DNA sequence: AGATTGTGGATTGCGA
DNA sequence: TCGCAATCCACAATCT
């Protein structure tokens, strides 16, 4: 297939990842969750293209920052893992609202690591 | 069997 | 001009 951009949120799947597990409760969340939780915090992706749920599973293998946690730390476990992150790996601009068509045609918070680094809610207009 | 998680080779577009 | 996030896809091992 041809490759192509498609709308999504001006901020990296990293961040956006990141984001999402630092708010939860126990700081990890499973794939799912991540996914839900996403595009319901970042409702800018379109129904017409699913793809942006593959960039998310590649990215928790891709970034170090993601972490990889057992449900029985005793026990790897191949599939159904929870994800955190070291927020030590982040890189700082990974943070960075990006300069994309989308965010220009809107115009978003600058930066995410408020939210991702110093425990703040994330409360977008 | 087919769907899903996890990994990763590889190319793209586009902001800087 | 090109670094690098975004994206397309394949696959191994495992879940449903
Ligand atoms: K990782």
């Known amino acids: 297939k041809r490759y ?6 001006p901020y990296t799947y990293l961040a ?6 630092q708010a939860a409760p ?5 794939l799912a969750q991540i996914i839900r939780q996403v595009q319901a915090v970042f409702p ?6 699913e793809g942006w749920k593959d960039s ?6 891709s970034n170090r920052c993601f972490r990889k946690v057992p449900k029985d730390p005793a ?6 893992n929870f994800w955190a992150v070291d927020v030590s ?3 700082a601009e990974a943070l960075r609202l990006q300069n ?15 939210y991702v680094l110093h425990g703040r809610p994330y409360r977008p207009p």
């Open 4 to 9: 192509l951009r498609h709308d999504k949120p």
């Open 16 to 21: 956006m990842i990141a984001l999402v597990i």
């Open 26 to 30: 126990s700081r990890r969340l499973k």
């Open 44 to 49: 800018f992706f379109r129904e017409d293209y």
């Open 56 to 61: 998310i599973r590649h990215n928790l293998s």
């Open 75 to 80: 026990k790897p476990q191949a599939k159904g």
């Open 89 to 91: 790996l982040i890189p």
């Open 100 to 114: 994309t068509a989308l965010c220009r045609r809107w115009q978003f918070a600058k930066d995410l690591g408020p």
